[PDB]
Amino acid sequence: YDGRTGEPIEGPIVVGQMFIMKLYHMVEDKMHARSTGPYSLITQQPLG
Amino acid sequence: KGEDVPEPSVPESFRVLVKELQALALDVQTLDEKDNPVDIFEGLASKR
Amino acid sequence: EKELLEEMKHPSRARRAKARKRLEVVRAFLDSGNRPEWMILEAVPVLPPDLRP
DNA sequence: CTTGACAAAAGTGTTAAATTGTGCTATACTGGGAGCCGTCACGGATGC
DNA sequence: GCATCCGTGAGTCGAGGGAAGCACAATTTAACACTTTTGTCAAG
């Protein structure tokens, strides 16, 4: 059934129990932003 | 200050490139429409 | 350059190719205004220390 | 807007002390050592 | 005709990665009493 409408899904749906792992790759450790910051010694370009 | 950013200038990486090429004993010179040298170092590397 | 031009009329193809290569180098040096002996360093330039910090 | 001192922060000579640069040591000694293949494969150029 | 030499081989990101003395002469530095100038405070 559809929780938003209460009407059923027009076709039967494969529903079961499956084992799912939460991987080490998280957006918390991957989101990054910068306006200004450190610069390189020689080229004076921003670091990485 | 709420203004528009100014027109940019020569990158520092190009200045580093020119200085390294000079260190290789290569006379790299930036010229103008009339083939006269143009100082991209703001007079900071010209011996008086 | 004059000798290379004169040798450029040799019937042999390899001789003309060698003359052409040597003459291209000579023409480059003549037109550029560079001197050949400038290819040997008497004073070695030293990079500014901030580029070699 | 001024002198009329004066505590003090700064500048000025010498000196004793670390700190640093240089020479010298006399039995005889006399040509290095780390190398070491999945050697990377493949075009482009020179040149014998 | 082959032999040899040389330059080339994707991008962004993170993650951790990080024979030696000894003596002696010069030289430099630290320190130290002294003259300063440099601020101040006092009234005129």
UniProtKB/Swiss-Prot annotation, chain B:
Superkingdom as given in the UniProt entry: Bacteria
Known partners and oligomeric status: The RNAP catalytic core consists of 2 alpha, 1 beta, 1 beta' and 1 omega subunit. When a sigma factor is associated with the core the holoenzyme is formed, which can initiate transcription.
Protein family: Belongs to the RNA polymerase beta chain family.
Role: DNA-dependent RNA polymerase catalyzes the transcription of DNA into RNA using the four ribonucleoside triphosphates as substrates.
UniProt protein name: DNA-directed RNA polymerase subunit beta
Species of the source: Thermus thermophilus (strain ATCC 27634 / DSM 579 / HB8)
From Swiss-Prot, chain C:
Entry's family note: Belongs to the RNA polymerase beta' chain family.
Function of the protein: DNA-dependent RNA polymerase catalyzes the transcription of DNA into RNA using the four ribonucleoside triphosphates as substrates.
Quaternary organization: The RNAP catalytic core consists of 2 alpha, 1 beta, 1 beta' and 1 omega subunit. When a sigma factor is associated with the core the holoenzyme is formed, which can initiate transcription.
Protein name per the record: DNA-directed RNA polymerase subunit beta'
Taxonomic source organism: Thermus thermophilus (strain ATCC 27634 / DSM 579 / HB8)
Gene for this chain: rpoC
Residues of the full protein shown: 474 to 526 of 1524
